[PDB]
Amino acid sequence: LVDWRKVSEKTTLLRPIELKLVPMALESSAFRSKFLDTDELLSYVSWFA
């Protein structure tokens, strides 16, 4: 679902270890768009942990 060519054109100044850590930050920023609450996520995280 991600066209990695343009993501590479957005990470030209970056480095291989940051090229490795890009995808999880990208997914986090993807999850940023919607509207969601902290405490429900915290409760689910605690239950799963």
């Binding site: 509207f35 969601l36 609450d37 429900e40």
Partner: protein, 132 residues
Amino acid sequence: LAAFEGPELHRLPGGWANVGIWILIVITMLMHYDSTLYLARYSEKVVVPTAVVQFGPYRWVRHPIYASTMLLFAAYCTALRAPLSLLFLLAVCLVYYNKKAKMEEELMVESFGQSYSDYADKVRHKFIPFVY
């Protein structure tokens, strides 16, 4: 009517048959508390919501406070094992709560625009999960 149509007091059983009211009361307290907390954690004033609440019981039902009051009504009526009074209680509370829910729903539809509309499209069931 639950009091009268219900049988005489000390003849209702115990043991493993009195765990249902326990778990149902725990569920209605938990769901009411979650609904009230999620309704009050966003509003600045007493009832002035800023965003739309779509968390906890709100993602199962559109009016969880009223359904929790409904469920403790059913809990008292079921503790005494009287279905007909539970049904009449359900009828009258459905009528009034549905009227009041209709006015409040049209108010937040007018006030919030598309947000509460998509919230209501996500969860249609107003009082009972996939029953009403």
